Amino acid sequence: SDPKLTKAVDSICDQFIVTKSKISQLTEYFIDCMEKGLEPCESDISQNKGLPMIPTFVTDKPSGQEHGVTMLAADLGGTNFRVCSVELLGNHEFKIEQEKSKIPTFFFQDDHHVTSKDLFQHMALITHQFLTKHHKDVIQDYKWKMGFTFSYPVDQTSLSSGKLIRWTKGFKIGDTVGQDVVQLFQQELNDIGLSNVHVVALTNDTTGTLLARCYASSDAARAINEPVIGCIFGTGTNGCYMEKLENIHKLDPASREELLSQGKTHMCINTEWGSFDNELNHLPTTSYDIKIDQQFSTNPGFQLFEKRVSGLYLGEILRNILLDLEKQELFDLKESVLKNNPFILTTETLSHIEIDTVENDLQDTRDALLKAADLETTFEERVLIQKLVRAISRRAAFLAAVPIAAILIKTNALNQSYHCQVEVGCDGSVVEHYPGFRSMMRHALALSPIGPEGERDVHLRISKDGSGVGAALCALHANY
Amino acid sequence: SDPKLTKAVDSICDQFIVTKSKISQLTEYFIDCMEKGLEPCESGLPMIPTFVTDKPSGQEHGVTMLAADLGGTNFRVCSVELLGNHEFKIEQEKSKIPTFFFQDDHHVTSKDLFQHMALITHQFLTKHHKDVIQDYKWKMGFTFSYPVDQTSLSSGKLIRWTKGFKIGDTVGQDVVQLFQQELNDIGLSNVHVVALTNDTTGTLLARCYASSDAARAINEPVIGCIFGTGTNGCYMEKLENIHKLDPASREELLSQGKTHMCINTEWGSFDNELNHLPTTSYDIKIDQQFSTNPGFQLFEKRVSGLYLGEILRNILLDLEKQELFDLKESVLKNNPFILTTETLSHIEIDTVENDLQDTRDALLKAADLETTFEERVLIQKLVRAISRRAAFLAAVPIAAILIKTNALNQSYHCQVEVGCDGSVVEHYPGFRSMMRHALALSPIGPEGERDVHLRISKDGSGVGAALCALHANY
Numbered sequence: 001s002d003p004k005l006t007k008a009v010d011s012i013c014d015q016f017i018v019t020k021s022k023i024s025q026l027t028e029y030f031i032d033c034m035e036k037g038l039e040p041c042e043s044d045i046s047q048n049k050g051l052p053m054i055p056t057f058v059t060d061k062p063s064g065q066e067h068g069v070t071m072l073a074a075d076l077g078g079t080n081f082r083v084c085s086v087e088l089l090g091n092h093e094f095k096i097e098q099e100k101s102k103i104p105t106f107f108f109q110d111d112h113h114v115t116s117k118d119l120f121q122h123m124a125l126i127t128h129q130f131l132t133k134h135h136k137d138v139i140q141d142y143k144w145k146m147g148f149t150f151s152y153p154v155d156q157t158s159l160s161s162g163k164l165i166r167w168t169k170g171f172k173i174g175d176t177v178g179q180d181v182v183q184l185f186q187q188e189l190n191d192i193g194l195s196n197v198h199v200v201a202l203t204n205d206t207t208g209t210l211l212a213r214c215y216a217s218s219d220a221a222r223a224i225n226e227p228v229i230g231c232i233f234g235t236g237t238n239g240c241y242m243e244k245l246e247n248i249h250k251l252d253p254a255s256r257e258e259l260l261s262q263g264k265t266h267m268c269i270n271t272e273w274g275s276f277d278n279e280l281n282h283l284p285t286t287s288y289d290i291k292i293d294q295q296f297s298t299n300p301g302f303q304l305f306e307k308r309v310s311g312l313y314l315g316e317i318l319r320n321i322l323l324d325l326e327k328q329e330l331f332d333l334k335e336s337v338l339k340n341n342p343f344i345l346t347t348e349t350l351s352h353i354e355i356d357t358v359e360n361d362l363q364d365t366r367d368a369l370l371k372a373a374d375l376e377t378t379f380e381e382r383v384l385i386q387k388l389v390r391a392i393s394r395r396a397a398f399l400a401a402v403p404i405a406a407i408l409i410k411t412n413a414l415n416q417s418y419h420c421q422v423e424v425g426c427d428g429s430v431v432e433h434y435p436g437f438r439s440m441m442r443h444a445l446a447l448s449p450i451g452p453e454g455e456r457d458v459h460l461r462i463s464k465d466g467s468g469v470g471a472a473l474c475a476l477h478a479n480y
Numbered sequence: 481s482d483p484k485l486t487k488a489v490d491s492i493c494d495q496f497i498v499t500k501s502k503i504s505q506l507t508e509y510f511i512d513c514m515e516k517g518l519e520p521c522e523s524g525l526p527m528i529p530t531f532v533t534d535k536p537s538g539q540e541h542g543v544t545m546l547a548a549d550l551g552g553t554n555f556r557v558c559s560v561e562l563l564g565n566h567e568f569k570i571e572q573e574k575s576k577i578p579t580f581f582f583q584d585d586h587h588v589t590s591k592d593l594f595q596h597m598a599l600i601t602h603q604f605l606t607k608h609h610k611d612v613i614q615d616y617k618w619k620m621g622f623t624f625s626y627p628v629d630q631t632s633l634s635s636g637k638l639i640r641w642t643k644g645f646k647i648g649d650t651v652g653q654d655v656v657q658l659f660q661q662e663l664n665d666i667g668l669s670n671v672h673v674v675a676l677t678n679d680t681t682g683t684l685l686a687r688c689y690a691s692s693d694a695a696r697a698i699n700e701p702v703i704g705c706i707f708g709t710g711t712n713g714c715y716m717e718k719l720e721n722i723h724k725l726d727p728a729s730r731e732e733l734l735s736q737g738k739t740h741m742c743i744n745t746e747w748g749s750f751d752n753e754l755n756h757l758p759t760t761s762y763d764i765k766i767d768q769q770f771s772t773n774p775g776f777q778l779f780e781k782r783v784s785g786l787y788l789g790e791i792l793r794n795i796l797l798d799l800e801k802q803e804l805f806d807l808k809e810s811v812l813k814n815n816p817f818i819l820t821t822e823t824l825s826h827i828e829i830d831t832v833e834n835d836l837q838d839t840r841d842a843l844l845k846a847a848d849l850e851t852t853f854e855e856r857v858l859i860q861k862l863v864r865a866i867s868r869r870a871a872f873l874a875a876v877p878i879a880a881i882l883i884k885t886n887a888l889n890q891s892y893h894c895q896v897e898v899g900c901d902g903s904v905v906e907h908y909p910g911f912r913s914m915m916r917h918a919l920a921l922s923p924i925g926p927e928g929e930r931d932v933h934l935r936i937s938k939d940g941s942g943v944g945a946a947l948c949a950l951h952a953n954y
């Protein structure tokens with residue numbers, strides 16, 4: 001109906017394309033950043049230019065035959081906080097009781113002064129609520145062991161210790177930076193009578209996701225399919241992998257020898273790849289990415305890879321595209337509430353647009369936009385909104401493949417025995433529930449330097465409740 | 481060590497290769513054969529209309545149905561309770577088909593077979609439903625994994641046995657009536673066989689029920705296929721293209737809201753004239769001398785598990801005839817099928833770091849054949865060549881069906897699900913991995929393979945038959 005608008009949208013969509021040359025470039029560059037990040041660096045190198053590459057101090061992959069009594073797990077994500085009790089029954093089977101709760105909006109508002117006690121006191125109260133609901137008879141009696149999944153960068157110094165490096169994903173609470181999050185959590189657990197709950201392990205949600213797969217993958221699967229990566233595509237994005245103790249040079253040269261003599265070969269590395277190429281030397285970037293990064297984001301100049309991929313930021317990318325189109329007097333935003341409401345459009349809104357069909361006049365897209373920001377749309381307007389949404393997601397799914405391809409290349413995980421496949425454990429609302437996201441990740445992997453023959457040997461498998469199960473596996477190992 | 485032998489194996493392995501050009505040839509020919517078979521012949525693939533028009537949703541729920549599945553090797557009886565929400569409860573008893581039915585030494589008739597099946601049905605009810613065996617009015621779906629000239633959901637005459645089965649007086653007989661008669665003759669007349677289906681058809685219906693509603697959105701199950709004792713697959717075909725179907729019945733189905741009918745391609749018969757199928761000296765020998773249906777099921781005889789181990793046995797004998805391979809005190813000679821696909825599965829992925837000990841034990845257990853390490857090294861090359869050819873041919877019918885129905889380019893992000901059942905696709909190391917490799921080489925390309933998901937349906941046959949029982953009336 002409006003040709004100038006229809007051509008303006010086509011032009012904005014081309015800005016989101018990721019070519020095979022870009023995939024190859026970013027794959028090779030990612031490995032260079034992995035190698036820079038695997039070396040020791042100062043507390044603050046103005047330009048380290050290497051990935052975080054955080055040693056998680058996990059050296060043993062689960063077998064699936066692990067067995068124990070019910071453990072506890074606490075997972076602080078980017079959106080929800082989960083508590084659960086996991087009983088590992090061996091033979092690749094387990095029992096789980098879990099309660100999930102949203103992180104109250106109070107914690108993401110800078111209008112009020114929020115502190116670390118507010119946060120962990122809330123987490124401890126939920127821990128108590130969970131035990132009162134699922135273990136009412138033995139809440140204050142048992143000596144619970146708890147694995148703590150903290151989905152944020154931690155300067156991990158042991159399996160049970162580590163200081164928060166910097167918040168990400170809308171969290172901003174100053175007095176937590178530099179604090180050992182295990183003690184912070186343990187402190188508020190003691191102050192409500194749950195001193196009998198010992199937080200014996202700290203892990204990232206990437207690490208836990210990987211550990212979960214190693215346990216649940218059937219012996220028949222572990223035979224040919226070995227899980228090699230645990231990654232997340234939800235509110236934020238990140239992934240881990242196993243690195244030879246020799247290549248982890250930033251690890252104490254003494255500790256490496258001590259671990260090696262004990263029969264250990266690798267240690268899990270938390271790449272923290274949401275920070276990948278924070279200097280934007282190569283990452284695809286639009287004017288809307290800069291605006292989100294600099295103005296609306298709580299961590300400007302950080303997590304730039306994340307800000308193009310994870311579900312916390314994609315819906316916001318659409319909102320800025322629409323406002324810019326209204327600024328240019330091309331798209332009528334009517335009485336919508338997009339203006340002056342950052343992040344009002346969530347990725348959950350786009351998921352209803354991604355696969356909406358024109359055979360129903362894109363009625364889901366209409367309802368989703370009215371429900372999310374009281375925005376009315378014509379059919380031609382929804383058609384164009386869908387083109388933008390599908391371009392924003394395709395870029396995210398294509399970028400999502402680069403860190404995976406890069407890791408598989410560096411560790412030569414695909415050059416294995418005959419018929420051997422590798423398994424990539426994925427968790428998060430995006431990879432789990434965004435229509436066609438995994439399908440596009442594979443398309444990118446086939447374009448990556450590993451090629452279609454490589455993509456076929458890679459299996460992106462979902463591990464629901466991954467974060468928590470893995471933490472429990474670490475709790476079973478450590479002592480009370 | 482034997483250098484002349486090492487070159488004989490390389491030459492036999494190259495004879496099993498399937499190139500991308502050959503896959504493309506066989507795919508297009510398969511589609512040509514599908515279209516021929518959808519025409520009347522008054523006398524192309526079988527392309528049998530199964531009279532199934534409705535795909536289950538997954539929310540179906542009803543009383544416990546019964547199912548009886550006569551495979552190529554086992555006979556199963558089970559009770560299926562459809563609980564809706566893509567879930568069901570099942571109690572089943574599985575039993576080998578006694579060797580008496582595969583021996584031509586004794587005169588076998590149809591009564592022998594169905595009399596045995598009815599007794600198994602009775603035992604099952606006596607063991608799992610003793611209180612309501614003679615009280616309830618059971619509805620039973622019958623899975624008959626053999627070509628049937630299907631004339632309705634509850635009727636159809638056997639066309640021809642396959643897979644070692646040979647019972648002459650069954651050909652031309654409606655197998656549902658035969659089964660129902662022996663059920664009545666032991667008091668189980670209250671068990672009504674209300675539906676007849678192929679194991680391909682049931683496999684598809686089962687997946688459509690179990691495939692999560694979230695999966696049904698983008699992932700639609702489009703094929704139910706089998707890679708076990710034999711091989712075969714089905715799909716949904718536009719009622720318009722099924723010209724061999726009565727033009728009247730077509731019109732009535734359309735008016736009732738129906739659009740497609742499931743087609744049993746019987747793709748084990750694909751290219752029985754060997755106009756294009758890869759053929760070795762050993763395939764002819766199996767077809768002409770050792771097979772129970774010479775000149776039939778030739779595609780099957782190169783793919784399914786009943787024949788792959790036998791292909792190795794003939795390769796070994798030929799190498800011994802040529803005084804190249806020492807067969808020791810083995811019993812391979814004059815013992816067809818003594819080498820099973822289950823024997824090859826232990827060889828496929830055996831490693832040299834263990835001196836290929838699995839292959840050694842597997843060969844001794846199956847035919848008291850001792851082997852040196854270098855001999856096992858070469859036997860592994862043969863096994864891997866036989867299986868790769870099977871998995872590559874196995875991809876052709878799937879690609880062909882997906883192309884004919886243009887199932888992959890139906891909407892943005894559209895994926896298709898192929899339901900697979902059978903000991904080979906389920907449990908043969910790397911079989912699915914090689915099938916996908918072939919699909920990527922097929923005319924659908926790597927972009928197509930990625931949109932295709934080979935999903936396993938363990939207990940499909942029976943659940944699908946139960947879903948047909950729920951529909952039909954007592």
Ligand SMILES: OC[C@H]1O[C@@H](O)[C@H](O)[C@@H](O)[C@@H]1O
Nearest residue numbers: 151152153168232236237238
């Ligand atoms: O939740 C996914 C990822 O989000 C990122 O912001 C954090 O830095 C990671 O630790 C986490 O794994």
Ligand SMILES: OC[C@H]1O[C@@H](O)[C@H](O)[C@@H](O)[C@@H]1O
Nearest residue numbers: 625626627642706710711712
């Ligand atoms: O069991 C797999 C297939 O084997 C073939 O021999 C039969 O003719 C088919 O009806 C059956 O579906």
